[PDB]
């Protein structure tokens, strides 16, 4: 009633069992050994089953470093999925992907109830759908793509545009005063940020209403997948059995799919178009179909996806659009203009941009802004080759305004105070909807080109211009 | 590879460009890449060769000038150069024909032309007899005699 | 009118001198994109061919 190891290929281990004792999918295996001779090394290991390959063998993915695995050693099957604590006891603590504490403050005994990670998504008779605004105070976001309570918000950007800056700004502006349970899963980010936010939370007193698990870059490919699931299995309990609204933050969930590409080539699968595992859509669906609202509560999750390059046609980020309810996109080319945040106004959309949910004065200004920006985008080649002075008077007047709108999309964040001489400023929705009206009708458009950069409300623009002479 | 392998057996090929399909000038045969073994003096005669070559060369010449126009403007080019466009537009428009099997899509019965009238009409269009008739009058007409009627209709 | 006609040709000289520059940068960057598109196309083609050969 015990297993063996015969083949090791790095992240993949090809365990073997006897007749009648085959594990199921997602089952957990444990290996313990102590040195019999001085040439051996002591390591305790845990593994996750993924495939059955006949001849009494199953494929498994390692959860820790596989160095020193001598062939012929014994394996233990728990017979149950990986179990991680959940409930009241997990507030304020920090765990690894396996569920043990890594904050060194203490242990968590067995009296705390723990659940399996993998469970099927809710049936159609259990789901619910409602639309209502979640507010953040950001000028560029709140107008052209307001968020929906209990929905999914997606962040898209290259290898550094300010994704983590936006996530921490949202946390500083919403998570503390929202009144709901907060979970932050540090999936695949830098370990420095992971240990910086721990201080940021403990010294600020918010840690009493937060739960976290970390899976940062240093960890082997098997661990980087299940950090998101271990983060979600706690928000699920907070939503269901306690009736609390839950906010969930994930930074590099893309590191899920990439991890699969690392292990699939070793499992023995044929390659996809660009070498991915031929299970991208189904596995991402099985991941994101559990982040849902119900009739008992709502889960709102803000996530970011790592785009492998300045090419959105890549299948892994392109197939993310099948689940998002609000989209925000970043690009380097606008970040380099000196405008932060560099959200593209003609590719960020939201379901909440409807006229019965936001009012006429909101839909009108949103559509007007998008229409005015489209023409300036189209005039790009001809203004670049020959100059802005070529076009006619009616086009020159239009040229006079789009860049000012783009500048007005900039705003100083609260975490930017260490890099800027002013602290973060707040602009409510009723103010961000109002603001674009003045520029569109020409109330303040005559101000110079740089005054609209790094400003809050529209009144600050005029005083900054006066300070400039 | 499939068109490359097919190109080696035809005696005469006519090419269709989707750009001509979108321009609204049917049929979409591009004159430049359409070639045949018949264009020899002993089969079509001398009255055919000179006119066909002149039209072909003019339509090749216009191709790059129209692209230069897209950036350099419309009057920075010399008037002699602009005359090439002024006549090539008419030449390309007159290539359209109102077919008989397209009555469902067109709602029109069509018209009929013999080859003598085709060579004759191209000789007139190069002669300068129709410089003042609008270009849009040449869309989807058959015999050249129809054009003066359509302008009469306008 | 003579002063204006001289300044007109001066302004035209300046206009062409500015216009003739950005073209070369735009060609060099498109040509780079062209080689990258080439290399990507060849790499994808060989990867598909060798995957088929390994399968069969």
């Amino acid at each position: 009633t015990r297993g063996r190891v015969i083949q090791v290929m790095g992240p993949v281990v090809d365990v073997k069992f006897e007749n009648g004792h085959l594990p199921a999918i997602y089952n957990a295996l444990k290996i313990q050994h102590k040195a019999r001779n001085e040439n051996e090394v002591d390591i305790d290991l845990t593994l996750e089953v993924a495939l059955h390959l006949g001849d009494d063998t199953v494929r498994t993915i390692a959860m820790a470093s596989t160095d020193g695995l001598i062939r012929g050693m014994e394996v233990i099957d728990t017979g149950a999925p990986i179990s991680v604590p959940v409930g009241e006891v997990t507030l304020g603590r920090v765990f690894n992907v396996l569920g043990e504490p890594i904050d060194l403050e203490g242990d968590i005994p067995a009296d705390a109830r723990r659940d399996p990670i993998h469970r099927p998504a809710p049936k159609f008779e259990e789901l619910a759908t409602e639309v209502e605004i979640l507010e953040t105070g950001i000028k560029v976001v709140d107008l052209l793509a307001p968020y929906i309570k209990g929905g999914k918000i997606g962040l898209f950007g290259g290898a550094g545009v300010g994704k983590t800056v936006l996530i921490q700004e949202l946390i500083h502006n919403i998570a503390q005063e929202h009144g709901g349970i907060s979970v932050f899963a540090g999936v695949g980010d830098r370990t420095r940020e992971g240990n910086d936010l721990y201080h940021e939370m403990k010294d600020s007193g918010v840690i009493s209403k937060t739960a976290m698990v970390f899976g940062q870059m240093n960890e082997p490919p098997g661990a980087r997948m299940r950090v998101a699931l271990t983060g979600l299995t706690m928000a699920e309990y907070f939503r269901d059995e306690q009736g609390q609204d839950v906010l969930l933050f994930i930074d590099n969930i893309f590191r899920f799919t990439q991890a699969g590409s690392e292990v699939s080539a070793l499992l023995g699968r044929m390659p996809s178009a660009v070498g991915y595992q031929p299970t991208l859509a189904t596995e991402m669906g099985q991941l994101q179909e559990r982040i849902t609202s119900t009739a008992k509560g709502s889960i709102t999750s803000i996530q970011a996806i790592y785009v492998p390059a300045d090419d959105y046609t890549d299948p892994a980020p392109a197939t993310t659009f099948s689940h998002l309810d609000a989209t925000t996109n970043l690009e380097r080319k606008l970040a380099e203009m000196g405008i932060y945040p560099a959200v593209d106004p003609l590719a960020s959309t939201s379901r909440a941009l409807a006229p019965e949910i936001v009012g006429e004065e909101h839909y009108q200004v949103a559509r007007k802004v998008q229409q005015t920006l489209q023409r300036y985008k189209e005039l790009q080649d001809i203004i670049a080759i020959l100059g802005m002075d070529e076009l006619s008077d009616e086009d020159k007047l239009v040229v006079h305004r789009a860049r000012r709108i783009q500048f007005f999309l900039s705003q100083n964040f609260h975490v930017a105070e260490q890099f800027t001489g002013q602290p973060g400023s707040y602009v409510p929705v009723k103010e961000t909807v109002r603001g674009f009206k003045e520029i569109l009708e020409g109330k303040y458009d005559h101000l110079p080109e740089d005054a609209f950069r790094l400003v809050g409300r529209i009144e600050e623009v005029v005083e900054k211009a006066k300070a400039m002479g | 590879p499939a068109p490359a392998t097919t190109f080696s057996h035809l005696d005469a090929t006519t090419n269709l460009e989707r750009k001509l399909a979108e321009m609204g000038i049917y049929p979409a045969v591009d004159p430049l890449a359409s070639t045949s073994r018949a264009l020899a003096p002993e089969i079509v005669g001398e009255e055919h060769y000179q006119v066909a070559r002149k039209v072909q060369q003019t339509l090749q010449r216009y191709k790059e000038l129209q692209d230069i126009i897209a950036i350099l403007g419309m009057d920075e080019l010399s008037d002699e150069d602009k005359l090439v466009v002024h006549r090539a537009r008419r030449i390309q428009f007159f290539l359209s024909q109102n077919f008989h099997v397209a009555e469902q899509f067109t709602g029109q019965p069509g018209s009929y032309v013999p080859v003598k009238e085709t060579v004759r009409g191209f000789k007139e269009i190069l002669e300068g007899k129709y410089d003042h008739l609008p270009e849009d009058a040449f869309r989807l007409v058959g015999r050249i005699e129809e054009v003066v009627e359509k302008a009469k209709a306008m | 009118l003579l002063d204006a006609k001289a300044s007109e040709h001066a302004a035209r000289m300046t206009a062409m001198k500015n216009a003739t520059d950005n073209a070369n940068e735009l060609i060099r960057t498109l040509t780079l994109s062209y080689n990258r598109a080439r290399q990507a196309a060849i790499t994808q083609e060989i990867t598909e061919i060798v995957a088929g050969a390994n399968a069969l």
């Binding site: - | 403007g73 | 007109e8 035209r12 206009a15």
Partner: peptide, 30 residues
């Protein structure tokens, strides 16, 4: 009475705007 003169065709750069604008402003202002 006022006299204004401009270039006769395009690709002239900013020669055309800088004079038409100023002449127009200086006349409608007064």
């Amino acid at each position: 009475g006022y006299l204004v003169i401009t270039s006769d065709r395009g690709l002239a750069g900013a020669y055309n705007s800088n004079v038409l604008r100023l002449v127009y402003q200086t006349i409608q202002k007064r």
